[PDB]
Design a protein around this nucleic acid. Structure first.
Ligand code: K
Ligand code: K
Ligand code: MG
Ligand code: MG
Ligand code: MG
Ligand code: MG
Ligand code: MG
Ligand code: MG
Ligand code: MG
Ligand code: MG
Ligand code: MG
Ligand code: MG
Ligand code: MG
Ligand code: MG
Ligand code: MG
Ligand code: MG
Ligand code: MG
Ligand code: MG
Ligand code: MG
Ligand code: MG
Ligand code: MG
Ligand code: MG
Ligand code: MG
Ligand code: MG
Ligand code: MG
Ligand code: MG
Ligand code: MG
Ligand code: MG
Ligand code: MG
Ligand code: MG
Ligand code: MG
Ligand code: MG
Ligand code: MG
Ligand code: MG
Ligand code: MG
Ligand code: MG
Ligand code: MG
Ligand code: MG
Ligand code: MG
Ligand code: MG
Ligand code: MG
Ligand code: MG
Ligand code: MG
Ligand code: MG
Ligand code: MG
Ligand code: MG
Ligand code: MG
Ligand code: MG
Ligand code: MG
Ligand code: MG
Ligand code: MG
Ligand code: MG
Ligand code: MG
Ligand code: MG
Ligand code: MG
Ligand code: MG
Ligand code: MG
Ligand code: MG
Ligand code: MG
Ligand code: MG
Ligand code: MG
Ligand code: MG
Ligand code: MG
Ligand code: MG
Ligand code: MG
Ligand code: MG
Ligand code: MG
Ligand code: MG
Ligand code: MG
Ligand code: MG
Ligand code: MG
Ligand code: MG
Ligand code: MG
Ligand code: MG
Ligand code: MG
Ligand code: MG
Ligand code: MG
Ligand code: MG
Ligand code: MG
Ligand code: MG
Ligand code: MG
Ligand code: MG
Ligand code: MG
Ligand code: MG
Ligand code: MG
Ligand code: MG
Ligand code: MG
Ligand code: MG
Ligand code: MG
Ligand code: MG
Ligand code: MG
Ligand code: MG
Ligand code: MG
Ligand code: MG
Ligand code: MG
Ligand code: MG
Ligand code: MG
Ligand code: MG
Ligand code: MG
Ligand code: MG
Ligand code: MG
Ligand code: MG
Ligand code: MG
Ligand code: MG
Ligand code: MG
Ligand code: MG
Ligand code: MG
Ligand code: MG
Ligand code: MG
Ligand code: MG
Ligand code: MG
Ligand code: MG
Ligand code: MG
Ligand code: MG
Ligand code: MG
Ligand code: MG
Ligand code: MG
Ligand code: MG
Ligand code: MG
Ligand code: MG
Ligand code: MG
Ligand code: MG
Ligand code: MG
Ligand code: MG
Ligand code: MG
Ligand code: MG
Ligand code: MG
Ligand code: MG
Ligand code: MG
Ligand code: MG
Ligand code: MG
Ligand code: MG
Ligand code: MG
Ligand code: MG
Ligand code: MG
Ligand code: MG
Ligand code: MG
Ligand code: MG
Ligand code: MG
Ligand code: MG
Ligand code: MG
Ligand code: MG
Ligand code: MG
Ligand code: MG
Ligand code: MG
Ligand code: MG
Ligand code: MG
Ligand code: MG
Ligand code: MG
Ligand code: MG
Ligand code: MG
Ligand code: MG
Ligand code: MG
Ligand code: MG
Ligand code: MG
Ligand code: MG
Ligand code: MG
Ligand code: MG
Ligand code: MG
Ligand code: MG
Ligand code: MG
Ligand code: MG
Ligand code: MG
Ligand code: MG
Ligand code: MG
Ligand code: MG
Ligand code: MG
Ligand code: MG
Ligand code: MG
Ligand code: MG
Ligand code: MG
Ligand code: MG
Ligand code: MG
Ligand code: MG
Ligand code: MG
Ligand code: MG
Ligand code: MG
Ligand code: MG
Ligand code: MG
Ligand code: MG
Ligand code: MG
Ligand code: MG
Ligand code: MG
Ligand code: MG
Ligand code: MG
Ligand code: MG
Ligand code: MG
Ligand code: MG
Ligand code: MG
Ligand code: MG
Ligand code: MG
Ligand code: MG
Ligand code: MG
Ligand code: MG
Ligand code: MG
Ligand code: MG
Ligand code: MG
Ligand code: MG
Ligand code: MG
Ligand code: MG
Ligand code: MG
Ligand code: MG
Ligand code: MG
Ligand code: MG
Ligand code: MG
Ligand code: MG
Ligand code: MG
Ligand code: MG
Ligand code: MG
Ligand code: MG
Ligand code: MG
Ligand code: MG
Ligand code: MG
Ligand code: MG
Ligand code: MG
Ligand code: MG
Ligand code: MG
Ligand code: MG
Ligand code: MG
Ligand code: MG
Ligand code: MG
Ligand code: MG
Ligand code: MG
Ligand code: MG
Ligand code: MG
Ligand code: MG
Ligand code: MG
Ligand code: MG
Ligand code: MG
Ligand code: MG
Ligand code: MG
Ligand code: MG
Ligand code: MG
Ligand code: MG
Ligand code: MG
Ligand code: MG
Lengths: 45, 92, 271
RNA sequence: GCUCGCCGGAAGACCAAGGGUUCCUGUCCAACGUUAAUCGGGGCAGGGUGAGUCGACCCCUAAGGCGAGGCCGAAAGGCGUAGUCGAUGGGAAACAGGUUAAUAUUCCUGUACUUGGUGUUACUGCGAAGGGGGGACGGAGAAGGCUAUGUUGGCCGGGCGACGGUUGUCCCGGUUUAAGCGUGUAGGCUGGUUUUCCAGGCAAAUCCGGAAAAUCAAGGCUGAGGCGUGAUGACGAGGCACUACGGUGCUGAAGCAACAAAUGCCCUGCUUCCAGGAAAAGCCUCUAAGCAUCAGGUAACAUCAAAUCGUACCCCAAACCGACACAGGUGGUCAGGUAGAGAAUACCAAGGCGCUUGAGAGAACUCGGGUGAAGGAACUAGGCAAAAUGGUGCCGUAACUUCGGGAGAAGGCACGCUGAUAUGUAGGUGAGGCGACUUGCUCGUGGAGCUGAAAUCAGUCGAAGAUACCAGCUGGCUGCAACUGUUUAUUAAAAACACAGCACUGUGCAAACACGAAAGUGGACGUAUACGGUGUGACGCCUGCCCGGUGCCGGGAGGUUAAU
RNA sequence: AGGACCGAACCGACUAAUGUCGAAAAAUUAGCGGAUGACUUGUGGCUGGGGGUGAAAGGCCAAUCAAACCGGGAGAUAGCU
């Protein structure tokens, strides 16, 4: 009966993507964290 | 016209039923080309290396299959094939 | 004009339309209209700053000339048009040299009437002049507060300013509020009264008719909970609070005038 | 394989999104599949996605994002100008049939089309960061013509029937054909020129606008479909030749007419209304700065060029979103027959499936149904639940009313089939024919078929003719809320909220007010017949008294009173 | 003409029974309301935590809401078990 995740790759990338993160001071720090932790998938891309 | 590099375009001839049926009946050759490799470059390469009269080149990108074996996933490389149609002066 | 509608459906019972037969039945003059997107009340920060606005019919902006400069050029009124952006109707004025422009339609104006603007001209409804040249004790509209500007005062349907006096450089104007405001004599004012005075006698008749005018429902403070509005809560229709805005400031008799830069121009406040 | 069953406005067939190889082939059955499994969307290999025209890309922009300078902000950063991005919108062009185990508007065959680059000829006044036109726009409604499509004859090929009849109005099946390039129609829109001219389109302009004066009865524009042609082509019921039993090359009959007919198309039309209905490029046009045997344009032609990425498969689902092969959720498109107002419902066609544990038995009890003597709400908190009523036509219909309503009030009666009126009528569509106008995709003119209600009169069968499915229960008194609407996603749909209307009140525009250290936005490109706040809640009759208290507004003497 | 009427799609959620280690962390079945409008829906945007949004229910803001979620202060503190 209509769940929360209703996927859309445009929305996904525009919202959470690499360039979306790069755009902002705080979004750049997220990447700096995921790199510091050492994640394989740095963003969803 | 693009000397030296033309040699790097054509990787190998492709072997299949669909490839074979298109030898005699359609007068084409199917072949694995470089991931770059434009239809002009494939044509110009066949025109020099194989040295035959090319009518037109059709091209596509084949997606690699995800082969999970043992306990690890691993996908094949994406490779590009080119159906190269030949003129009436044909051989191989 | 004011026609009451027959009650064939509830919500068509109380409807009262202002049918103007002299208005135009066709598309407007394209060169003098640009697009006008809707805010829905929100601003730069995307936040509702003015409540109760949102939706309504898509409506394009007519580039109406208020300043009305183009001097010494008589201009024939081609047709009176509807303006969705405005209370008052507009008139498509064709200037003798071959411009067209929109103006606010005064009371006594019709498709065919001739209008002039500038310094000399004639004292007749539609003709814009400086308020120095206009007679004392005369009905104007579309009045400038500053010389060279457009026209701020008296642009709503049926609205008009009356010129009370002229002290040298300054002209004392009695506004429709009742406020007596002093403006500069070099400022311009279009003669007569603003048309479509029947506008006020329109009555909508249904909730829907406010929605398609771009208004959204007003919820009463008393209905809400304490957290939302100062009036709030109570176990069944309580109040016991002095009337106030949603932001605590007292409504219902509480002067919020605090300009202090323009208090020199106000002769008598309204009453 | 043959029966049986179920869907068929879907449980069919194409897509988008989203998945991401699930496609197809061979092979394997440990695990995965709620059972077995030789099977599989499972394991393991191997194949499979072919584009100048379909999509993306590109070209333009909307909401909006980012944003050189900038303005503002302890710092971070915020807003925003020039710009630059941003589709869900605007912008060139491809169709038919054939083919693969799996792609096809992509391959093949047959016919086309578009935009560029680049050479020759014959002409000639060309060129934007600019001007103008266009693109280019709402709801509803109504009609007319069409087509998709269907039906019935006609023609063509077979057929003469497991049990009575069946060479006839008998039976089955077929009767298909594209884009393009011509023809400019049903229709819709308009005045068309010629020269002059003018404070306008910020400069310029021959273009647009405005003003002239003449000149002819119209000339353009737009436009479905039909006819053409494409097409001696393809396809085609079948045969013939042959079987790895798969077929495959060859041949390949008819391939018409009538009638009905869209929610498609003409139609971005037309009437009509008020709530008054994107933008920008492509495109045509006009000239400045410029440039004059230049450069550019223009046609006709020849030749190149059209890159790149997507293309499998599922897509109301076992492949997406729901942890599951999950009785959920998920946008667009296509829309056959008989009955029917219908996309309801029933039965069906094309096509698709029988829902992945079965087999017995036929206890209580539970679930979903059917029927029920006499009774008929006695049940129960409450007629909860079931039973009822249900269609069309015509007749008939109360109080009260805001004069629309109430009202489908209530209550009635008539319906099947078959003849006749009329060897199927009012109508509908109207062929050959008769004249005539100009030149035709003509007009009248007549009606050949074809289609076809609804009545009436008589007959006639049943217990019953709106025979199934489908499909109002009705009335009386009354509280609350005028009304349609909104609401507690998931125990509350209400008398709660909203509502039109009403009043108070603020606000003179750099408005009040709102978001924000601010800049700045919204209010509003609005201006007191406007805007915000507050209460009340259609409408009708009304809305009485109190200013001691608390607030608010005004007043300014006196008293009191900070920093300084 | 109509926030007109009846009625499918579509949007909803009034009654009942079922289901309640469900087929399903809200559904099914049979009825039910709206169905040219204050309608509905696709695609993309904007508003952010004492903040948004709210035809107002303390409703909604990713199955979480009288103050979301994640990380941190942090081994908060607990005269209590
Ligand atoms: K069968
Ligand atoms: K601490
Ligand atoms: Mg998002
Ligand atoms: Mg840090
Ligand atoms: Mg991390
Ligand atoms: Mg990830
Ligand atoms: Mg090709
Ligand atoms: Mg390709
Ligand atoms: Mg690899
Ligand atoms: Mg911003
Ligand atoms: Mg904005
Ligand atoms: Mg912001
Ligand atoms: Mg308001
Ligand atoms: Mg809205
Ligand atoms: Mg406006
Ligand atoms: Mg408005
Ligand atoms: Mg207004
Ligand atoms: Mg002075
Ligand atoms: Mg308000
Ligand atoms: Mg109100
Ligand atoms: Mg209020
Ligand atoms: Mg409440
Ligand atoms: Mg709040
Ligand atoms: Mg409070
Ligand atoms: Mg309460
Ligand atoms: Mg009370
Ligand atoms: Mg009290
Ligand atoms: Mg107080
Ligand atoms: Mg206070
Ligand atoms: Mg207060
Ligand atoms: Mg007052
Ligand atoms: Mg069924
Ligand atoms: Mg059907
Ligand atoms: Mg498709
Ligand atoms: Mg998946
Ligand atoms: Mg993938
Ligand atoms: Mg796999
Ligand atoms: Mg398979
Ligand atoms: Mg096996
Ligand atoms: Mg076994
Ligand atoms: Mg094994
Ligand atoms: Mg098993
Ligand atoms: Mg299991
Ligand atoms: Mg298999
Ligand atoms: Mg498999
Ligand atoms: Mg392409
Ligand atoms: Mg097309
Ligand atoms: Mg795209
Ligand atoms: Mg390109
Ligand atoms: Mg461009
Ligand atoms: Mg762009
Ligand atoms: Mg903008
Ligand atoms: Mg922008
Ligand atoms: Mg910015
Ligand atoms: Mg620079
Ligand atoms: Mg700088
Ligand atoms: Mg800067
Ligand atoms: Mg400043
Ligand atoms: Mg910023
Ligand atoms: Mg801009
Ligand atoms: Mg798009
Ligand atoms: Mg296009
Ligand atoms: Mg397009
Ligand atoms: Mg096309
Ligand atoms: Mg085809
Ligand atoms: Mg063929
Ligand atoms: Mg063939
Ligand atoms: Mg396939
Ligand atoms: Mg060809
Ligand atoms: Mg040929
Ligand atoms: Mg030819
Ligand atoms: Mg040709
Ligand atoms: Mg063309
Ligand atoms: Mg061309
Ligand atoms: Mg332009
Ligand atoms: Mg459009
Ligand atoms: Mg329309
Ligand atoms: Mg209507
Ligand atoms: Mg009519
Ligand atoms: Mg019609
Ligand atoms: Mg036809
Ligand atoms: Mg056809
Ligand atoms: Mg027949
Ligand atoms: Mg025979
Ligand atoms: Mg027989
Ligand atoms: Mg016999
Ligand atoms: Mg015989
Ligand atoms: Mg037949
Ligand atoms: Mg037949
Ligand atoms: Mg043509
Ligand atoms: Mg041509
Ligand atoms: Mg043409
Ligand atoms: Mg013509
Ligand atoms: Mg000029
Ligand atoms: Mg001209
Ligand atoms: Mg013509
Ligand atoms: Mg033309
Ligand atoms: Mg044609
Ligand atoms: Mg026709
Ligand atoms: Mg034909
Ligand atoms: Mg034709
Ligand atoms: Mg012919
Ligand atoms: Mg021919
Ligand atoms: Mg043939
Ligand atoms: Mg066969
Ligand atoms: Mg017909
Ligand atoms: Mg039909
Ligand atoms: Mg138009
Ligand atoms: Mg062109
Ligand atoms: Mg030209
Ligand atoms: Mg070539
Ligand atoms: Mg080419
Ligand atoms: Mg496909
Ligand atoms: Mg399929
Ligand atoms: Mg399927
Ligand atoms: Mg499907
Ligand atoms: Mg479904
Ligand atoms: Mg399906
Ligand atoms: Mg679940
Ligand atoms: Mg799943
Ligand atoms: Mg299953
Ligand atoms: Mg499912
Ligand atoms: Mg379902
Ligand atoms: Mg019937
Ligand atoms: Mg059905
Ligand atoms: Mg099962
Ligand atoms: Mg038993
Ligand atoms: Mg039993
Ligand atoms: Mg039962
Ligand atoms: Mg039972
Ligand atoms: Mg029964
Ligand atoms: Mg019964
Ligand atoms: Mg009984
Ligand atoms: Mg009995
Ligand atoms: Mg009985
Ligand atoms: Mg009884
Ligand atoms: Mg009793
Ligand atoms: Mg009792
Ligand atoms: Mg009782
Ligand atoms: Mg009771
Ligand atoms: Mg009862
Ligand atoms: Mg009941
Ligand atoms: Mg019962
Ligand atoms: Mg009974
Ligand atoms: Mg019943
Ligand atoms: Mg009965
Ligand atoms: Mg009965
Ligand atoms: Mg009955
Ligand atoms: Mg009846
Ligand atoms: Mg009575
Ligand atoms: Mg009464
Ligand atoms: Mg009745
Ligand atoms: Mg009646
Ligand atoms: Mg009877
Ligand atoms: Mg009869
Ligand atoms: Mg007759
Ligand atoms: Mg007879
Ligand atoms: Mg007879
Ligand atoms: Mg007959
Ligand atoms: Mg008869
Ligand atoms: Mg006859
Ligand atoms: Mg007759
Ligand atoms: Mg007759
Ligand atoms: Mg007749
Ligand atoms: Mg006719
Ligand atoms: Mg004719
Ligand atoms: Mg006859
Ligand atoms: Mg009858
Ligand atoms: Mg009789
Ligand atoms: Mg009888
Ligand atoms: Mg009888
Ligand atoms: Mg019946
Ligand atoms: Mg009912
Ligand atoms: Mg009653
Ligand atoms: Mg009582
Ligand atoms: Mg109510
Ligand atoms: Mg009441
Ligand atoms: Mg709502
Ligand atoms: Mg709603
Ligand atoms: Mg709701
Ligand atoms: Mg609830
Ligand atoms: Mg909700
Ligand atoms: Mg909840
Ligand atoms: Mg509820
Ligand atoms: Mg409920
Ligand atoms: Mg309710
Ligand atoms: Mg109630
Ligand atoms: Mg209320
Ligand atoms: Mg009053
Ligand atoms: Mg008042
Ligand atoms: Mg502030
Ligand atoms: Mg400021
Ligand atoms: Mg504005
Ligand atoms: Mg109230
Ligand atoms: Mg009275
Ligand atoms: Mg009172
Ligand atoms: Mg007092
Ligand atoms: Mg007193
Ligand atoms: Mg007091
Ligand atoms: Mg005061
Ligand atoms: Mg005071
Ligand atoms: Mg004083
Ligand atoms: Mg004093
Ligand atoms: Mg003192
Ligand atoms: Mg002292
Ligand atoms: Mg309406
Ligand atoms: Mg209605
Ligand atoms: Mg009714
Ligand atoms: Mg009903
Ligand atoms: Mg749906
Ligand atoms: Mg429900
Ligand atoms: Mg619900
Ligand atoms: Mg009940
Ligand atoms: Mg039951
Ligand atoms: Mg249980
Ligand atoms: Mg169960
Ligand atoms: Mg239901
Ligand atoms: Mg019912
Ligand atoms: Mg009903
Ligand atoms: Mg109703
Ligand atoms: Mg929705
Ligand atoms: Mg969205
Ligand atoms: Mg946002
Ligand atoms: Mg918080
Ligand atoms: Mg926080
Ligand atoms: Mg904050
Ligand atoms: Mg705030
Ligand atoms: Mg709401
Ligand atoms: Mg409460
Ligand atoms: Mg929640
Ligand atoms: Mg809650
Ligand atoms: Mg808290
Ligand atoms: Mg807190
Ligand atoms: Mg969260
Ligand atoms: Mg620490
Ligand atoms: Mg602890």
């Amino acid at each position: 009966m209509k769940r929360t995740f209703q996927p859309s790759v445009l929305k996904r990338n525009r919202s959470h993507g690499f360039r979306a993160r790069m755009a902002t001071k705080n979004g750049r720090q997220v990447l700096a964290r995921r790199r510091a932790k050492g994640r394989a998938r740095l963003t969803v891309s | 016209i693009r000397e030296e590099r033309l040699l790097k375009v054509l990787r190998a001839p492709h072997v299949s039923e669909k490839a074979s049926t298109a030898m005699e009946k359609s007068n084409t050759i199917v072949l694995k080309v470089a991931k770059d490799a434009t239809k002009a470059e494939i044509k110009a390469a066949v025109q020099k290396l194989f040295e035959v009269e090319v009518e037109v080149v059709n091209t596509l990108v084949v997606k690699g299959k995800v082969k999970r074996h043992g306990q690890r996933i691993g996908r094949r490389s994406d490779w590009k094939k080119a159906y190269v149609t030949l003129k009436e002066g044909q051989n191989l | 004009a004011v026609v009451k509608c027959k009650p064939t459906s509830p919500g068509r019972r109380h409807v009262v339309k202002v049918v103007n037969p002299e208005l135009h039945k066709g598309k407007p003059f394209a060169p003098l209209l640009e697009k006008n997107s809707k805010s829905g009340g929100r601003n730069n920060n995307g936040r509702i700053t003015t409540r109760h606005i949102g939706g309504g019919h898509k409506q394009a902006y007519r580039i109406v000339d208020f300043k009305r400069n183009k001097d010494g050029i008589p201009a024939v009124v081609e047709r009176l048009e509807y303006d969705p952006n405005r209370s008052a109707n507009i008139a498509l004025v064709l200037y003798k040299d071959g411009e067209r422009r929109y103006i606010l339609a005064p009371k006594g104006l019709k498709a065919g009437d001739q209008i002039q603007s500038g310094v000399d001209a004639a004292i007749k409804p539609g003709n814009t002049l400086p308020m120095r040249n206009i007679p004392v004790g005369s009905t104007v509209h579309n009045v400038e507060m500053k010389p060279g500007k457009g026209g701020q005062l008296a642009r709503s349907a049926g609205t008009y300013v009356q010129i009370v006096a002229r002290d040298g450089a300054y002209v004392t104007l009695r506004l429709r509020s009742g406020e007596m405001r002093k403006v500069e004599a070099d400022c311009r004012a279009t003669l007569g009264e603003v048309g479509n005075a029947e506008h006020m006698l329109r009555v909508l008749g249904k909730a829907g008719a406010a929605r398609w005018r771009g208004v959204r429902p007003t919820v009463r403070g008393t209905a809400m909970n304490p957290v939302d509005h100062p009036h709030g809560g109570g176990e069944g229709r309580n109040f016991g609070k002095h009337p106030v805005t949603p932001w605590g400031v007292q409504t219902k008799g509480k002067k919020t005038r605090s300009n202090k830069r323009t208090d020199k121009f106000i002769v008598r406040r309204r009453s």
